A = this chain, B = another copy of it.
Amino acid sequence: QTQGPMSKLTVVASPLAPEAVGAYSQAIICNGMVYCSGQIGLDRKTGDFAGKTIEEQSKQVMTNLKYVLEEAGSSMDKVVKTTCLLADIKDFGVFNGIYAEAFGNHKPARACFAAAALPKGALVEVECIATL
């Protein structure tokens, strides 16, 4: 329900996902679609990476994405398309296992690649578009 003179773009700010400090928001909702920033494997509780391994960072990324999606009114089952960026193509298999477990039976469209490097030395970054 409306709370006085709702806008075309809505900022999503989950207190469970890493804080968007800086020139970006965790996600923006526009015309019923949720446009999510590329999450990295930071744990909001410590402000640091969940660990130094692709396994630990990948699990934290997928958890962070869930937090943002649920905050927006969306969910993992409503994700339309993801893009999955790795610091090292050799880590793609371990990533894929964790990604598949996080989505269960739901299978978004996807594009993946190894970047030359990611912000903050992250080993993995995942962004997505979802629906309400």
Interface residues of A (CB under 8 A from B): 8-9, 11, 20, 22-28, 30-33, 35-38, 78, 80-81, 83, 85, 89, 92, 96, 99-100, 103, 107-119, 125, 127, 129, 131
Contacts and interface: CB of A to CB of B under 8 A. Distances in A.
Nearest to A87: B116
Given A20-B107, A113-B85, A30 B33 contact: yes
Nearest to A23: B100
A114 B115 CA distance: 6
Given A31-B33, A36-B109, A114-B118, 12 more contacts: A9-B80, A11-B107, A20-B107, A23-B107, A24-B109, A28-B109, A31-B32, A38-B111, A83-B127, A89-B119, A109-B127, A115-B116
Give how many copies assemble into the complex. 3
B113 A81 contact: no
B96 A22 contact: yes
17 contacts: A24-B109, A24-B110, A25-B107, A25-B109, A26-B109, A30-B33, A31-B31, A31-B32, A37-B110, A85-B111, A89-B117, A89-B119, A92-B119, A113-B117, A114-B116, A114-B117, A116-B116
